[PDB]
Design a protein around this nucleic acid. Structure first.
Lengths: 114, 54, 119, 122, 207
RNA sequence: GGCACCUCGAUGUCGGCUCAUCGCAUCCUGGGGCUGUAGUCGGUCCCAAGGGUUGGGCUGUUCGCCCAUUAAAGCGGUACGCGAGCUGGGUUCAGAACGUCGUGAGACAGUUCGGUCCCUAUCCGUCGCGGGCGCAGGAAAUUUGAGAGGAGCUGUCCUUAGUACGAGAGGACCGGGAUGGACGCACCGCUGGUGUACCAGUUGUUCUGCCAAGGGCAUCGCUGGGUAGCUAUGUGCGGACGGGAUAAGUGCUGAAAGCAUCUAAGCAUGAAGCCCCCCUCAAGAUGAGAUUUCCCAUUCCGCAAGGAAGUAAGAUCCCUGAAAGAUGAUCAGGUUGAUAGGUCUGAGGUGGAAGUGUGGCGACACAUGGAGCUGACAGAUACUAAUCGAUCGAGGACUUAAC
């Protein structure tokens, strides 16, 4: 896909920090409520890390007011401003789907600091 | 699925028209032959362009 | 894609692993033309594993090649011959190790046959 | 993504506990329902203290869905639990408060007053 | 009405200006050459036989070599007319390279569909499956032909069969960006056909 | 219902699941005339089959009732459409009961429980794909489109407007603007689904002499993810913008009947109808078309008619295969070569391999190291296999006219 790679390069976002699939990074996202853009911080654990250049995405997730939220973020979207990895975490796998059902302290066991 | 009637000899032979197998292609061997169909080792000398492997 | 041969998938692994072992001792084998085409893809990869000479690579050969005796008196394992004989013989060459000449159809069921041998 | 005969737990202080769906109001028509869709619904269960009572037939607007909602930005949202707020005729919610996160998809619709009661919007 | 037909290679996502995600199809498009120009007073109709993807002489037939000789061009593969070009448009033999298409133009797309192979009616026509339980042997099968009175199957009655490989129009697709240096087209929305298949890029009807 | 002309050496009943199509006395949408039509919303009679025609509860049911909807949830024909497609729930076999009738044996358009629905498609039919010959010489192509099919439905909101109207209450016609439903056509790059020669973890037993590290089997042993391909519940698009003659209507000039009068003369207006615009198959449209570019005008017989043997353009047999595919066919190719496999470099997937060292009593953990493993996805590389060859294939019929 060398030609396909040539197109994606123009929209490539090298500014984004490198990170492991298992961590509590905090994506910033402007929201056009109209007219001013609010900045909603959203901490959570990433799970999926699908490949495919610009099409790459990751699934940050967070419990909120007793209920979880699954807000996927594409890796190279313009809407992201900055990403801060508050904590690193050891992971025996790559697809941590199971943790969402394991409320609540059990989820923290996979969230061990590194 | 029981047929209502016996087939006529005409329709039968007409069905037989396409049933026949086609003749395989053949070529003379560079070494001796004869002959050898394309892209397969001869059962005779066993030569293959033109190496002798059995 | 990969050919099925109609075999059960569990059988398909053993069916390939058996042919890979029999080629080691016999150096050459005649089988059906279609199975022969499938055969070259698996065996040549095994030869690549023997190139590095790595101890980890030898264990990978055990996953496929079975523990059958090769040459008489020498008592070499079927795995061992690849790391001692075939590897040195193809240190220069890179791929194309297994030529497969076609052969006439078998009388017993019309199945086309093909010779398989290293080169 | 919600099919007919799909119980949906209550997200507001209507006094109801669980609320089964009846039929989508959209078209002849659509069976599926994302967020912001209005659906007539039955109250299978309810807390003893509240205006709502069991077996009542009242419309409710979807607030949360297990299915991943789509946006033009490409961002997706899928809550751990499905939810709806009870509403009658005028779209002001019967619930004094709305528990949990609320989808922003409601905001594009003139449903904005409901959004104001939300503790947080995602 | 212009149409630089060319093979697609791979699907891509492309965002610009607005933050919304826009799916995009790559197209090889350029270069193309006018092998011939039809005339209504002689050929009976207005058309231009554009070619695509030049190839070595070894694959070219002798009569094909003569057809391009008038075009002052090397022998080339597929050829299609595009009624109705605005004559005189271009001089004979002139090259074309994506210059016509702007990002704002709406563009119809036509091409051979990907082969699904021989298939059942449910895929071929979307017919509902029969019950899988309650002792019913019936499922997947197309069902009754219809009325007994005609004593014949109605023509055009749906039956399972091979699908795909037929040319299929997809109207009103929109271009996203233009890359003339790489001869790339970037049309929004799905474009029908197998990977690396030829695809026409005719101008959309307006308005 | 009546009659007993089809069938009692077999026409398998009812209601559904399946797919339909047809006809209008048109449920809705579009066109209107009259209203006890203020507006809004209706009533009625005329145009109109183009399209759309609901999800459940009760009952074997049709029907009907009820609930929630919808622009509307119209009827009927097609062996009360379809069982060599399916369902046996209802009646319509043999068992058993209740109630009633009969001395009994049994019976009951009275009811209840259980109860083998057989069949390899010959022909005509239809959905797809080839092999032949023809198309007055052989070919490679590109297409004209006689004809044929598909598509054909609509909701809301934002404006003009809170204006026209109405005491108020209510609330438009028309012209524009955005967003959905139902359905249809396509593609995976997102969302995912699957993914049996991909990766990892793990159980029992057995096999590699024992360790470490693996193999076989147990549904792929099980479990967790997933390339490609295949896919919708995902995405993108579709019914748009307009003409031609009209239907019911609305008419304009004017006569037969000096006035009058849509018509008898003559000119208009006028609909999701019809014809095209839109998309698709199509010159076996034996009416066999048209245009572009190639091969040449042979060699042998027979005085003639006509027939053979080679070849040119080109194609095939065979072979590497897939963007194709049941088999043919189609397309990419056949050694001045990337067609497939392999070999290298990647992408993606699964993710800290083996070995070694260190910490710990052990079990394990850490380091070496985003390592290792990689089936179909890419980029190059003749390293292998697409050998060597063979076969098919035209010498342009006779007339008339213009030259």
């Amino acid at each position: 896909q060398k030609l396909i790679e040539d197109i994606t390069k123009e929209q490539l976002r090298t500014d984004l920090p490198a990170f492991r699939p298992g961590d509590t990074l905090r994506v910033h996202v402007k929201v056009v409520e109209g007219n001013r853009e609010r900045i909603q911080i959203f901490e959570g654990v990433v799970i999926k890390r699908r490949g495919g250049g610009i099409s790459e995405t990751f699934t940050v997730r967070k419990i909120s007011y007793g209920v979880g939220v699954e807000r996927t973020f594409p890796v190279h979207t313009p809407k992201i401003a900055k990403i801060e990895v508050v904590r690193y975490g050891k992971v025996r796998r790559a697809k941590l789907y199971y943790l969402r059902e394991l409320r609540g302290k059990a989820a923290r066991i996979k969230e061990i600091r590194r | 699925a029981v047929p209502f009637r016996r087939t006529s000899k005409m329709k039968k032979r007409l069905r037989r028209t396409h049933f026949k197998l086609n003749v395989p292609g053949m070529t003379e061997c560079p070494s001796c032959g004869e002959m050898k169909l394309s892209h397969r080792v001869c059962k005779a000398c066993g030569s293959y362009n033109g190496k002798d492997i059995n | 894609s990969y050919r099925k041969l109609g075999r059960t998938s569990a059988q398909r692994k053993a069916m390939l692993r058996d042919l890979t072992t029999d080629l080691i001792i016999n150096e050459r084998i005649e089988t059906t033309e279609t199975r022969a085409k499938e055969l070259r893809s698996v065996v040549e990869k095994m030869i690549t594993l023997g190139k590095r000479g790595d101890l980890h690579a030898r264990r990978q050969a055990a996953a496929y090649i079975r523990n059958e005796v090769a040459n008489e008196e020498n008592n070499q394992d079927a795995l061992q011959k690849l790391f001692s004989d075939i590897a040195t013989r193809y240190e220069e060459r890179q791929g194309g190790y297994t030529r497969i000449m076609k052969l006439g159809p078998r009388r017993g069921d019309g199945a086309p046959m093909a010779i398989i041998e290293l080169v | 993504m919600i099919q007919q005969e799909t119980r949906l737990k209550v997200a507001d202080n209507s006094g109801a506990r669980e609320v089964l769906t009846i039929k989508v109001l959209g078209g002849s028509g659509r069976k599926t329902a994302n967020i912001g869709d209005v659906i007539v619904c039955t109250v299978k269960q309810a807390t003893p203290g509240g205006v709502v009572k069991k077996g009542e037939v009242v419309k409710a607007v979807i607030v949360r869905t297990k299915s991943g909602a789509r946006r033009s930005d490409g961002s997706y949202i899928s809550f751990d639990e499905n939810a709806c707020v009870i509403i009658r005729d005028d779209k002001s919610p019967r619930g004094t408060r709305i528990f949990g996160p609320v989808a922003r998809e409601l905001r594009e619709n003139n449903f904005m007053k409901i959004v104001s009661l939300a503790p947080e919007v995602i | 009405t212009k149409g630089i037909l060319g093979r697609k290679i791979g699907m891509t996502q492309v965002f610009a200006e607005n933050g919304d995600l826009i799916p995009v199809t790559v197209i090889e498009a350029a270069p193309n050459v006018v092998l011939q120009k039809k005339t209504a007073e002689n050929d009976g109709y207005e058309a231009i036989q554009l070619g695509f993807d030049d190839k070595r002489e070894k694959l070219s037939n002798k009569p094909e070599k003569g057809h391009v000789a008038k075009a002052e061009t090397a022998p080339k593969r597929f050829v299609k007319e595009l009624r109705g070009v605005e004559m005189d448009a271009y001089e004979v033999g002139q090259e074309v390279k994506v210059e016509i298409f702007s990002a704002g133009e709406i563009v119809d797309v036509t091409g051979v569909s990907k082969g699904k192979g021989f298939q059942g009616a449910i895929k071929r026509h979307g017919q509902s499956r029969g019950p899988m339980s309650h002792g019913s042997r019936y499922h997947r099968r197309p069902g009754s032909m219809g009325p007994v009175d005609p004593n014949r199957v109605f023509k055009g009655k749906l039956l399972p069969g091979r699908m795909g490989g037929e040319q299929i129009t997809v109207q009103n697709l929109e271009i996203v960006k233009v890359d003339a240096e790489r001869n790339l087209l970037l049309i929004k929305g799905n474009v029908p056909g197998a990977k690396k298949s030829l695809i026409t890029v005719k101008s959309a009807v307006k308005s």
